[PDB]
Design a protein around this ligand. Sequence first.
Ligand SMILES: Cn1ncc(C(=O)NC2CC2)c1C(=O)Nc1ccn2cc(-c3ccccc3)nc2c1
Ligand SMILES: [Mg+2]
Ligand SMILES: [Zn+2]
Length: 316
Amino acid sequence: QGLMQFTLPVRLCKEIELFHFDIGPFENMWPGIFVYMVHRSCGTSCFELEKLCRFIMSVKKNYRRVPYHNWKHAVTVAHCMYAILQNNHTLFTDLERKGLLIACLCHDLDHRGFSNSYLQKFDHPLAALYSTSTMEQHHFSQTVSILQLEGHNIFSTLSSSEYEQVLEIIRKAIIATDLALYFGNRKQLEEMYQTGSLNLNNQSHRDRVIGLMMTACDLCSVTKLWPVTKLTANDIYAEFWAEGDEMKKLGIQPIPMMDRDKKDEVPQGQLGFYNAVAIPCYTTLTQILPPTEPLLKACRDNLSQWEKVIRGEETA
Ligand SMILES: Cn1ncc(C(=O)NC2CC2)c1C(=O)Nc1ccn2cc(-c3ccccc3)nc2c1
Ligand SMILES: [Mg+2]
Ligand SMILES: [Zn+2]
């Protein structure tokens, strides 16, 4: 008798299936939205509800009150993964469904709103511990610490070898969110797709596809309706500009996107980001996973919005 099913109001029940769904401003509804997505994408028996709830609330507590890399971003990235999984349900394993929504929820644990570059320039202790993907190795380590709390082992029914596999899916998925690694990963996938060598039975290939899925989920603000896209950009720059201030305090000239004095160049910066990162990301994903097309369509629609801003037909 596991007859306690999670339900959502009618609008949320329908719209959560859309790639461009926004999870809304009611923080207290996000745990329920996450459980609902786990129950539908994994199954009601994937996790003990009590342990999963305790886990969710400890993850929330270890996100910080920062403008962008916060609890809302964690659930937002998990929702984009939910939509990819639900529209490609025959392509993933039992352990991949169990691991990937958890990886998305945890992927920015204990973020302070600073890049790997800032931690290196600051000489933060984390940069000595983890020389590459500094924050991402920290996010994984935070994930392990939480899974090891009493009553928090959500994978308790897995064998030692299966637990190890799911922790390895999570580790690689979280590390893949280091955008420095995305450029190389997408190039390899594009090469593998265009030569017809890409093989979803090859684990090292599955790792690359999951990595690109993680990038796609992580950047998914560019795949929302324009008003969501535009408002989320404010939170992104709130963080970039705070880091730029901190770079200036260290006596280092920040890169342009982190300099608040360069505010008027944001529309052109966005255009650069969409052309160099977002459009290629969703293009390669759509080639590998054709049902993810709505992400690419929404990204192209937002690219056209930023062009309208640059021409002075829209105001930001
Ligand atoms: C929308 N989105 N979602 C995720 C990221 C992202 O990268 N997040 C980091 C990974 C955590 C962005 C993003 O907005 N990224 C960028 C990227 C490059 N830029 C350059 C300029 C620019 C500004 C003024 C002047 C000149 C340039 N602005 C940008 C913004
Ligand atoms: Mg991150
Ligand atoms: Zn993120």
